[PDB]
Design a protein around this nucleic acid. Structure first.
Ligand SMILES: [Mg+2]
Lengths: 467, 413
DNA sequence: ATACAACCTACTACCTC
RNA sequence: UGAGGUAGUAGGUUGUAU
């Protein structure tokens, strides 16, 4: 018989200084933080893809309703939410002929097919960036289904250096040109016209059309320079960092690459949220621990970035990771850390099998419920029933994060509150919240793109080039 | 008289006034504002006076630091007070406190006796208060679905939890009893000490040379006849309470290694007991699961919970998985699975179709069904009224009731 | 290379939002 | 890859003794 504490829901800062808990309920009521004048959209693909994208873009401008608006707030139209124009009259179209699509798509090797076809899609974007006088905010790459299906590492044809994945390769080959692009699937925008067996859609978007419009609009607004929202209760000079280890695969020897994300608040009360890139490499197979030199370089770069943005050194530095730091790592970290800076290394995992079932209800346990095992270990339910939207973030019984303060000493309640607050900064989607801290998720997103290529030297820090 | 009049400092309160006016128009209220409805090339003061006198039913005042002592705002307030006196309506003028820098003691004499609506903390809460007051006062409004959606969105934006006691059922089975001592049997050769160390009738393991057992040496006489002639020493004999409390030490064996060996022994005993119970076994990538057959229950309705069923033409069965652990306290984590068999005693070779069937079946179960099935399976596994035992003569006791959790917050469906 | 526990990642296939 | 979640399937590392 043990007691669960409850952590109050964090709030995000929308326009007019107003606060809210749901991004959809704050954007529809108050608006985005900063305003831009419009989105000049570039499109690449076949004329059918351009037609589909134009149809969706004209469809977005009107309000779209869901089956139940309480769980799914309606989309009031792009202009009525983001106060900027995203029309089909600003589209700059580039044609990829279906003849040239089928010239590379039927190569026997997946690697060569994906490389050639990514290059075909990429050259036009680069040429229109350098050799054309238009100004394009976001490049919307509409990708058919045949390309998408046969552009995976394990994909095979139906009996007649870089990664084999189309998306990661595509995003990695633009990193030296800093072009924010959004990859779309024709089924995403034209789900009604795509059927499999009996005239029914493969993807049933009928009940969730408003949510799809919300997610697409938020992603496009963020990619074009917008600031849809920001955290309100972010603390003082304490800065958060998040590390993720990835397998570089058969690029150059079995290697592991560590990529980071960083988050804090500047003197202007805004939110700084970027990545630490140039992945730090451990050559030992199966070893997800950074060597002392690599860890020293990583912490030095993070502290230098913080001091350049702020003007002094952070009071406290939190380091989220999915692994456990050994003592050599922390010795290397402390040899760079100044005296006034206090380091906490927190490990977040989602593999401990603890499910809490409500005794009588048909719904699941509340989100934000925490079970402090002890002063250095706790369980947090970042996925659970939300009274506001009256539906849990997961259909089944949710699994909680096991948050353990691996290194250093700090208040576990403050760690839990900071993690729950960090779960609200997912600019890649328009949701209430997600079950993972956004630092680790965005570090994973950065790493999956960085490890897809070998020619990257100085990757950009902004997330719109990766997400 | 349907108009709603909003007074403000014209170039300083533009943002809030426009926001509030557009919102109020959104829910079907007719609003008159000088920044949206005042015509060009018109006598604006006469028009404002005529609107206040003959058109407005409510008078909302944007009370801020700029509009506190603005002459036009004061003239509008005076005319509104005269109209309110004529109308015999006490709630005609409704100030809206939107500025924090304006103290509640520095307000002007015109609204010093009226209670404002707090917009400083939250604009949406202030709008909720305005809408509640309007509904109470029955302000005229002509609406259809969009207005209701916006009204519900404004009213439901502040929904939160209530202070209610809640009880949750977990999947952790707490271990109640432990063997008195941990026995290290120096068996020496003992005919390779039964090098299989996995087909023995009791859980056994070799740390350096001593078999780690909670039982006696003569309990292994059948599998190891040499242990019949082995001198009964079984030295060290660490008491379980001391080792489990992190007190045992010294270079013979580390504390963490001792705990890991205890966990291994518990897992081996759990597997042996489960195989003793005659339960069907399923091999997985990271663990093993146990599921009953169709004829194990009559008729698969233990405590009216059901453990076997038909999806379309295949027979789904609930399956259990156990994992003994010591952190934070000695417990057994229990995991749930669903396994599909085409016939009475068979299995489906393709793991892909098995996974697809499991995902299709688990989409319509919910926490109540999951918990009831888990509790029924555990209670079936229980050999007694309130506990079941794992055989180490020595034995350990684990309760059949999963440990509860308590919370001070909940919701109201 | 064998046995275990205690951690780690890459890869699909469904489900709903 | 519009986005989250839940599962399953493979592989590996450290430690403890042969
Ligand atoms: Mg995205």
């Amino acid at each position: 018989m043990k007691e669960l504490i409850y952590i109050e829901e964090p709030k995000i800062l929308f326009a007019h200084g107003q606060k809210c808990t749901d991004a959809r309920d704050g954007l529809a009521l108050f608006g985005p933080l900063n305003n831009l004048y419009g989105i000049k959209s570039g499109v690449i693909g076949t004329k059918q893809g351009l037609k589909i994208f134009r149809d969706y873009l004209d469809h977005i401008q009107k309000p779209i309703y869901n089956s139940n608006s309480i769980t799914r707030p309606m989309f009031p139209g792009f202009e009525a939410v983001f106060d900027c124009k995203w029309e089909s009259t600003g589209i700059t179209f580039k044609e990829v002929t279906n003849e040239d699509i089928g010239k590379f798509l039927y190569n026997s090797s997946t690697h060569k097919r994906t490389y050639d076809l990514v290059s075909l899609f990429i050259d036009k974007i680069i040429s229109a960036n350098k050799n054309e006088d238009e100004n394009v905010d976001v490049w919307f790459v509409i990708v058919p289904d045949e390309i998408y299906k046969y552009c995976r590492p394990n994909s095979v044809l139906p009996k007649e250096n870089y990664d084999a994945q189309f998306h990661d390769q595509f995003k990695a080959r633009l990193l030296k040109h800093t072009i924010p692009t959004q990859i779309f699937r024709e089924s995403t925008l034209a789900w009604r016209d795509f059927k499999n067996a009996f005239g029914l859609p493969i993807r049933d978007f009928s009940k969730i059309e408003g949510h799809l419009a919300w997610t697409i609009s938020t992603a496009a607004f963020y990619k074009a320079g917008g600031k849809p929202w920001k955290l309100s209760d972010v603390r003082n000079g304490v800065c958060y960092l998040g590390l993720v280890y990835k397998k570089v695969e058969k690029s150059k020897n079995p290697r592991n690459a560590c990529c980071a994300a960083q988050m804090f608040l500047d003197n202007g009360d805004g939110t700084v949220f970027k990545g630490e890139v140039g992945p730090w490499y451990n050559p030992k197979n199966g070893q997800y621990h950074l060597e002392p030199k690599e860890a020293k370089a990583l912490l030095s770069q993070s502290l230098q970035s913080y001091k350049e943005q702020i003007g002094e050194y952070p009071k406290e530095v939190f380091i989220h990771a999915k692994t456990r730091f050994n003592h050599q790592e922390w010795d290397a970290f402390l040899e760079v850390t100044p005296k006034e800076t206090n380091l906490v290394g927190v490990t977040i995992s989602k593999t401990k099998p603890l499910k809490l079932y409500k005794t009588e209800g048909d719904y699941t346990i509340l989100r934000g419920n925490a079970y402090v095992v002890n002063e250095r270990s706790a369980f947090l339910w970042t996925v659970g029933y939300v009274p506001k939207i009256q539906t849990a973030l997961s259909m089944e019984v949710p699994n909680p994060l096991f948050i353990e303060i691996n290194k250093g000493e700090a208040d576990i309640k403050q760690v839990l509150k900071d993690i729950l607050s960090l779960t609200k900064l997912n600019y890649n989607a328009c949701i209430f919240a997600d079950g993972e801290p956004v630092t680790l998720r965005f570090a994973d997103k950065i790493g999956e793109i960085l490890t897809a290529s070998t020619d990257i030297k100085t990757p950009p820090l902004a997330f719109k080039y990766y997400i | 008289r349907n108009k709603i009049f909003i007074s403000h400092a014209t170039p300083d309160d533009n943002d809030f006034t426009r926001w509030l006016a557009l919102k109020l128009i959104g829910l079907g209220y007719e609003v008159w504002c000088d920044i949206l409805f005042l015509d060009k090339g018109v006598d604006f003061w006469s028009n404002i006076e005529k609107v206040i006198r003959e058109d407005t039913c409510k008078f909302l005042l944007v009370s801020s630091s700029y509009s506190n002592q603005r002459e036009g705002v004061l003239k509008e307030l005076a005319v509104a007070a005269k109209v309110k006196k004529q109308l015999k309506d006490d709630k005609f003028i409704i100030p809206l406190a939107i500025d924090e820098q304006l103290s509640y003691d520095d307000i002007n004499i015109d609204i010093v006796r009226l209670n404002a609506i707090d917009f400083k903390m939250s604009w949406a809460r202030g709008l909720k208060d305005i809408l509640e007051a309007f509904e109470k006062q029955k302000v005229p409004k002509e609406v259809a679905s969009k207005s209701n959606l916006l009204y519900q969105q404004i009213f439901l934006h502040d929904k939160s939890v209530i202070e209610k006691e809640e009880i949750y059922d977990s999947n952790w089975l707490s271990i109640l009893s432990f063997p008195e001592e941990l026995r290290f049997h120096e068996y020496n050769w003992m005919l390779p000490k039964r090098f299989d160390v996995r087909e023995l009738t009791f859980p056994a393991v070799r740390y350096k040379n001593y078999l780690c057992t909670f039982a006696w040496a003569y309990d292994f006489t059948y599998h190891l006849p040499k242990t019949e002639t082995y001198h009964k020493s079984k030295t060290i004999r660490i008491p379980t309470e001391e080792i489990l409390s992190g007190s045992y030490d010294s270079n013979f064996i580390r504390n963490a290694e001792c705990k890991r060996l205890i966990v291994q022994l518990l897992n081996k005993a759990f597997e042996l007991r489960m195989k003793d119970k005659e339960v069907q076994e399923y091999e997985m990538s990271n663990k093993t699961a146990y599921w009953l057959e169709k004829g194990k229950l009559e008729k698969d309705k233990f405590e009216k919970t059901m453990l076997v069923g038909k999806q379309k033409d295949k027979n789904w069965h609930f399956a259990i998985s156990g994992a003994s652990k010591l952190y934070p306290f000695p417990v057994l984590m229990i995991s749930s699975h669903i396994f599909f068999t085409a016939d009475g005693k068979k299995l489906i070779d393709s793991s892909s179709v098995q996974h697809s069937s499991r995902r299709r079946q688990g989409k319509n179960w919910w926490n109540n069904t999951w918990r009831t099935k888990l509790l029924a399976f555990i209670k079936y596994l229980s050999d007694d009224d309130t506990s079941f035992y794992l055989e180490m003569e020595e034995k350990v006791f684990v309760s059949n009731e999963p440990v509860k959790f308590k919370g001070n917050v909940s919701y109201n469906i």
